[PDB]
């Protein structure tokens, strides 16, 4: 009875009735074994736990050097992760297993074959989460062996990789901190000056991985957990982020290498949106003096990658991400969409995406139309009444006649979730309207009252939900001042 | 709690209307929570 | 811009029973021939059908909305069926026989439920926007507060709310938009408009005018109250505070107001269907029909109302006359348009070539 | 530079750009590099070009599915097939082409494939009969035979896999089609039928095969009520509800303890998960005519949470999560005619599962303990205060005034308790938000404390609550400073 | 159930000089020693550390919360600080020096901006409830309504002004009260000419102009914006409601009712009014040298602390984690506050994902995919 085990192990979970060594020794049976072992690790109560915890790890351990086929080896790091996590709370165990148990399964861990990479990756990563102090012992095999596979073509080994190398300056603060973030925003500051020779054949193809994984790991430093405060030097990063974004492809050369480094544009400039995302989510809102450079990025980087879906189609849609984030973060303080010519670019930008334009597609631009209406709603219902009334009479001729005009081809709203972000906008208007300006309340009742008979389960619950919020505009409970 | 209104008053300027959601003429606003 | 028409009707139909103009063109989109409509009786089904309740008669004919011809399908009830109305959503159909309310049903087409409490004839049926309540006002000065939910599911049902504060027939009534948090706004010939409340049931208003009102309707935003009445005059009751609509000549029965508060349409009884511009009562157009207006509201056009070539999805069943699964559907529409975005048939073929290199 | 092609093969696609794929496809070494050529082209070609080379492209697909070659290969090969028959859909030359002469050939080839490669061939099935659905149709005895074998495999991507190509039968083929359906939903609800009447005897090895095939047929039927079909249907709800409550009615007292008990003891909550998935697929397809049968479905709530309640996680989560989403759908999808908290004997044996559900409670553990009941019931709680809000009574409003808010307060300013999740957060802080809104006329909500209570959100260490907290004082900025009396 | 503090500060400080002590019980929770506080100038910051101006000199104590001794941090301004007040958040702090509004921030310790535009002393500093705008008022009878965004990302030369100029009082200004909001709150600026204007601050009109009978010297409002609690230079406190509403403009107290409406018991000025969080008990200073709660809902008091001196500073606050423990050393030390006008961010990071930790059934299904997939 194998097969059946992995259901007998959920249905014996789901009853809770554990939480209230044997077939492991045989290469034939060592999944049988693993199964319970899994079960045993993962509800067992205090005392059972406490009590067989270090023999547990050590037949962990034993599986792990045994040349056993590499889904064995998988099952036997997942049990691992647990039995680390659950014994690092304990503190009798968690000493013993820090002092006399760690750098035997960091050694075993390390000296793996080379076709279990993943394993030993996802192993370690646990190892050094749970049991920070301990590994400083082999922190250079670690550096070295973290290193060798940042640049891995493997999306997934890449990204373990990444993960596990993001919190070298942890084991053992501050200084290592700050240390290690002066080294990669150098090595970053080199490979750019080998790949735009322009404007600042196979050894591109691998310069592009070597930037990507060393902006990976920065992105990663920036904004995971720590336990000591850091200097932050938000200048230099956005130097380079500002750097980065500052060749386009009308200064990129035609004559000889000049096809592969325009081919590869893109991909760094996501990256250096990636930079500015994890950026804006560490730092959080102090920012402020720093974001007129930030609102004026987003316009430039949406008007130098502007031209069936439309090309460039994931630029475009991390930016707008990434202004959901800005508005999100900051509140009403974050100064979009008012005043500026850069604020008159980005709402020139979020109105050509919005508007609706045989071998082809159905819902052409479905991505990019649902960004920039979830970042143009959120900006407007947060800073609001600090737009010209202007911008709000543009919308008001917009909107309104585009929410009674999808429920009556190649366009993007005839998704859901591009209709539901509509009907958000419409209610973000409604609920902060500029002084001047009053809102259509009459014209936008009646198209919350077209929406819930529609079909769909989200567009018809959302224009339910939205009609409640609207009674309350029109049945006042106190007297208007 | 509910307003009684002429029709040629209300035509001219000596009457108003003043409806809420959950009272007629009067907010019936206070509620009876507390922290304690 | 949307489009939108203005359904008018009449009582002595020479040769058609239904006359679908544009509101800001005058042309006559679709006509359809049949008998006469009942005062108080038409009601669009689902978008597709349109039901009309017969003058005096027992039967409710029904008209494709794109076929200028009765079809087969005619309804019967055992009396003089008085007012129709359709849920919104399009799923029951609501007759007015004698003193009973009849409840049907559309996708499979039996009677659910014979409801009978008014002391004399049913005379105006409506739903709150949403079909939650539907509320029937009778000639016995009673106005009852019915619920979709316990009505349904009994074993007798009984209502929610008995409003009894009027001395004299009800005429008209307008619920106002959502659920349990509409607002009703009835009328009856003792010359007083009513606006009640449907979460509580207590009067809130109850502005008394000079003359028999006999129409109520309320712009989507509750911010005027364009009360009829029986001399001619259309008056104008400003709820968020010269406001007299003049030019008719006899009782108004028909008012509906445009989507965007700023048009009137009115059906009186001296054949004419007039359109003021209601912010400095003036009058922009006055077809007059060949008999007294018997329905008349401003409808937004539909889908079927534009494609010369629409058929309906589903037909019609055959409508029972007697009391009491097998719910007749089409599939797969609540998940119409959720499809794999561009950024989705992509994603996945990128990670079915990567798993492949590996 | 083979490693290279995705990355080179994406950063092509990015910009939009669009001999060698057919040169590189006559070969084992290079048969990768090709099959993604081809992937690129076939997926972003003008119409001239797919017009000029999609009879070519797929007999080279086809060329290519009978060569015994790795794994791998056949699975690029079917993506890439999916795509193919997908674009050839639209073009009604290329469409009657195809249907008329490869499909028949392209059928065969795709079950001629090894044991090994199943899944491709499942996957390879339903791209030929979704979007072609006429042509295959000459072989459905054969789709049936190899669907029905594999609708019981243990593995959960092969089952679910079959049980989507299984339910595609009645659309196959050429009036009939509703008959077809018909016929196909009555023998799976008798074949439910007598299995469920094989696991209940009462009230070592076989049951685990009995289960199996229960649990494919029930998955069958779900997705058979839930899915896209071109006639119109007679769903049969009252058979469907019998079948639901049936399953629902044996609980854990009543499984006898002696001979083969315990097996049946612990294989009841797969059951009782597959009947509630079952009547949440019919929720989800007969949509709000569910209103006449109101009572059935708004008492196996209380009676489902009855036969499943009891630093630990309580026992019977995925059961108690899975009736609050089935309550939730219920509410969503009828409105304010749901009718459920109402008043009545089973409307308030199910407040108590809620209210006992959403409250708080040197040692092992975890702290998010019990995370997930607490996001469910209180989603539901939420959901059923929006729509159904008016109408219910004072004292339930006032019991969860009394509840809520000095819990909200205290999480804030004040170990191991459900509410340390950025969910179980942010569902309160919607639930208050619901209160608020739509209040019973009788008792007023207290609008001075939520207010101070939504002013400690917005200042929060988090971004989920922190933009809810401060996205709901734009909200309730309107109770308090209205525009008309 | 939550728990509510009144902290209160006495201008004579014999022993204590901010005594901490429970709103329905009475007792003691925190105090202080040190020097003398001063009218407006007392503001908590992060929940954390209790700074305070000094009366006459010019420069501001800082206590720790847990601590009742003071630290050997002093901000220093150059000229008498008047008034002071920490942004909600805590990310700033910003004091009143003479006519100067200086603007500090607390992560790195700079002073970014000298504000400057008032014509004489500035009396009254409060943050909008969430720290985008600051309203200011002084002693040449204006109030200014700044906006955070505006004066910390100008250009070096570029002298930002003030979003709005509210002139219409026509004597000093004593107190203020910014609601919750935003660019949607409310403010209730009230002077020395027997008035209390509530204005508006996304648009910039007045809405009402209540006047009084005596110089009013504290105005507070509730929550919900339902009563407006002004202060009197005789002792009576003042009532208005507005919800009631008659329907105009610029009313008048005495057609506004009386005698049931009024708050008595005072002998002398009332500098201090703050209400409740529910909204049914009013803690009002003087300076008569009481501080005494009263009954909103019945218009009687409860009771009459007595503190020795003019009482400066009373307020109400919902008890943070830092009084209720024990310990709780603070999460960052503070800086070194510069007096010269001027990267480098100090903070914690792993903040904005604190529990987004995987539930139990998600790392139940990821195990059970681990085996399903291996079992393959």
Same mark, same amino acid.
């Given at each position: ?124 990563? +646990? ?73 600042? +054949? ?280 | ?36 | ?45 689902? /978008? ?41 959503? %399009? ?21 659910? *439920? ?47 709310? #008995? ?29 007083? #408009? ?12 109850? *502005? ?23 001399? /001619? ?57 060949? /008999? ?32 009491? %699964? ?5 599939? /797969? ?18 990670? *079915? ?6």
């Amino acid at each position: 009875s194998a097969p059946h085990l992995p259901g007998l192990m959920c249905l014996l979970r789901l009853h809770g009735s554990v939480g209230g060594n044997a077939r492991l020794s045989s290469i034939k049976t060592r999944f049988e074994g693993l199964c319970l072992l899994s079960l045993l690790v993962g509800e067992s109560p205090t005392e059972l736990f406490q009590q067989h915890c270090v023999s547990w790890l050590r037949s962990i351990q034993q599986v792990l050097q045994t040349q056993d086929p590499p889904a064995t080896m998988e099952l036997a790091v997942a049990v691992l992760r647990d039995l680390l996590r659950y014994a690092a709370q304990l503190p009798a165990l968690f000493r013993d297993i820090s002092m006399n148990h760690l750098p035997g399964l960091l050694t075993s861990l390390l000296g793996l074959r080379p076709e279990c990479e993943q394993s030993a990756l996802e192993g370690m990563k +646990a190892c050094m989460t749970y049991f920070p102090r301990a590994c400083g012992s082999l922190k250079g095999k670690l550096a070295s062996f973290f290193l060798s596979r940042v640049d891995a073509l493997s999306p997934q080994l890449q990204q373990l990789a990444c993960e596990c190398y993001s919190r070298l300056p942890s084991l053992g603060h501050t200084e290592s901190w700050e240390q290690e973030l002066h080294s990669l925003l150098a090595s970053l500051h080199t490979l750019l000056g080998a790949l735009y020779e322009g404007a600042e +054949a196979h050894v591109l193809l691998q310069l592009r991985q070597r930037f990507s994984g060393l902006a990976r790991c920065l992105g990663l430093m920036l904004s995971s957990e720590f336990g000591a405060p850091v200097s932050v030097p938000v200048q230099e990063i956005l130097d380079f982020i500002c750097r980065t974004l500052s060749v386009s492809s009308k200064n990129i050369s035609l004559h000889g290498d000049g096809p592969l480094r325009l081919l590869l544009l893109p991909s760094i400039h996501l990256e250096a949106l990636d930079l500015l995302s994890a950026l804006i989510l560490a730092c959080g809102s102090r920012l402020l003096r720093f974001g007129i450079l930030i609102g004026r990025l987003l316009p430039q980087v949406l008007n130098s990658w502007s031209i069936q879906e439309r090309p460039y189609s994931t630029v475009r849609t991390k930016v707008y991400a990434i202004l959901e984030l800005w508005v999100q973060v900051c509140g009403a303080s974050a100064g979009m969409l008012q005043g500026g010519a850069s604020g008159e670019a980005l709402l020139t930008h979020l109105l050509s995406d919005i508007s609706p334009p045989r071998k082809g597609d159905s819902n052409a631009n479905s991505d990019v139309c649902a960004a920039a209406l979830r970042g143009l709603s959120r900006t407007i219902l947060m800073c609001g009444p600090l737009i010209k009334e202007e911008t709000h009479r543009r919308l008001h001729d917009l909107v309104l006649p585009l929410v009674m005009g999808v429920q009556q081809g190649s366009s993007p709203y005839t998704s859901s979730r591009c209709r539901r972000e509509l009907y958000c906008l419409l209610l973000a208007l409604l609920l902060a309207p500029s002084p001047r300006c009053p809102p259509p309340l009459a014209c936008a009742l009646q198209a919350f009252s077209l929406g819930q008979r529609e079909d769909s389960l989200e567009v018809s619950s959302f224009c339910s939900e939205a009609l409640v919020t609207c009674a309350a505009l029109t049945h006042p409970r106190v007297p208007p001042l | 709690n509910s307003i009684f209104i002429n029709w040629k008053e209300h035509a001219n300027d000596q009457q108003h209307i003043q409806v809420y959601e959950n009272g007629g003429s009067q907010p019936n606003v206070s509620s009876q929570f507390r922290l304690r | 811009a949307p489009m939108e028409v203005a359904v008018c009707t009449d009582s002595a139909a020479p040769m058609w029973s239904c006359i679908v103009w544009e509101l800001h063109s005058g042309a006559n989109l679709l006509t359809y021939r049949g008998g006469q409509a009942g005062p108080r009786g038409l009601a669009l089904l689902n /978008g597709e059908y349109l039901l009309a309740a017969q003058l005096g008669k027992n039967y409710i004919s029904a008209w494709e909305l794109q076929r200028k011809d009765q079809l087969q399908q005619k309804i019967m009830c055992p009396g003089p069926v008085t007012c129709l109305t359709a849920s919104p959503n %399009g799923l029951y159909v609501l007759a007015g026989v004698a003193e009973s309310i009849h409840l049907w049903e559309v996708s499979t087409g039996n009677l659910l *439920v014979i409801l009978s409490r008014h002391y004399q004839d049913v005379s105006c049926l409506q739903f709150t926007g949403d079909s939650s309540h539907f509320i029937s006002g009778g000639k016995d000065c009673l106005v009852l507060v019915w619920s979709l939910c316990s009505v349904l599911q009994a074993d007798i049902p009984a209502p929610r709310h #008995v409003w009894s504060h009027h001395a004299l027939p009800i005429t008209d009534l307008h619920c106002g938009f959502g659920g349990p948090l509409a607002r009703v706004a009835t009328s009856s010939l003792d010359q007083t #408009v009513k606006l009640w409340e449907v979460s509580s049931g207590e009067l809130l208003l109850s *502005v008394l005018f000079d003359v028999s009102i006999m129409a109520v309707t309320m712009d989507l935003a509750e911010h005027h109250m364009f009360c009829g009445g029986s001399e /001619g005059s259309i008056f104008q009751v400003d709820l968020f505070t010269g406001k007299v609509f003049k030019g008719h000549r006899n009782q108004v029965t028909c008012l509906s107001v445009s989507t965007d508060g700023s048009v009137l349409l009115s059906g009186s009884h001296d054949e004419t269907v007039r359109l003021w511009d209601v912010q400095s009562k003036q009058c922009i157009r006055t077809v007059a029909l060949k /008999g007294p207006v018997t329905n008349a509201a401003i409808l937004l056009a539909p889908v079927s109302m534009l494609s010369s070539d629409f058929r309906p999805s589903l037909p019609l069943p055959h409508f029972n006359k007697h009391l009491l %699964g097998g719910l007749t559907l089409r599939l /797969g529409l609540h998940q119409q348009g959720s499809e794999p975005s561009y950024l989705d048939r992509t994603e996945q073929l990128q990670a *079915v070539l990567c798993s492949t290199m590996e």
